[model samples]
Target: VTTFVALYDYESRTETDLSFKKGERLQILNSSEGDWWLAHSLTTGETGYIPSNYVAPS
Candidate 1:
């Protein structure tokens, strides 16, 4: 399994902290055009939906 890093603000858009590492694998529960959805990182079972800059492939 890999690890990755991500930034997010739960209080802004009800997003959760995936706490991913530097090279992890995550699944986009709802891949939309805007920043609003749920994400699940299979690596650590982390879930969240931060902003575009907040959520990145780290």
Candidate 2:
């Protein structure tokens, strides 16, 4: 499983989902050539799209 660190808190544009805190570790589920990527939060188990520039590989 690929892991990444959130560079900043990212609030999802979709309502039902929560936000990602800075320095939080997330699991990479899917990544594309685009700016958006799919990730799963290791702390909350929340999955959603986060901007590619918002995280760094760990």
Candidate 3:
């Protein structure tokens, strides 16, 4: 399936940083932050700002 893969555990420094675990599947919702893309964690059932670099398209 067309999806995203987390590279590593991303730490949330800002209030908007979307912390995700390694090998976690993510759904890219939107992209307005340019670098920070909106991602939804299927594992957590929540969404937040995510850095595209932190994730890899699969």
lDDT of 3 by residue, 1-58 (tens): 3368899888778777788899888888554358877788877776777777777775
lDDT of each: 0.50, 0.80, 0.77
Q: Which one wins on TM-score?
A: 2
lDDT of 3: 0.77
Predicted candidate 2 versus true structure: per-residue lDDT over 1-58, tens digit per residue = 3898899998877854447999888888665467877788897888877888898877
Tens digits of per-residue lDDT for model 1, 1-58: 1222345333433335344454455566445577554556676675775344445553
Model 2: weakest 10-residue lDDT segment is 10-19
Over 4 Å off, model 3: 31-33
Residue 21 of candidate 3: its Cα lDDT?
Answer: 91
User: Which run of 10 residues does model 1 get worst, by summed lDDT?
Assistant: 1-10
Which residue pairs show collisions in model 1?
2-23, 3-21, 3-22, 3-23, 3-24, 4-21, 4-22, 4-23, 5-21
Residue 32 accuracy (lDDT) in model 2: 48
For model 3, give the 10-residue run with minimal summed lDDT.
29-38
Residue 16 shift from truth in candidate 1, angstroms: 2.8
Each model's TM-score, in the order given? Answer: 0.46, 0.80, 0.74
Model 1 residue 42 CA deviation (Å) reads: 0.6
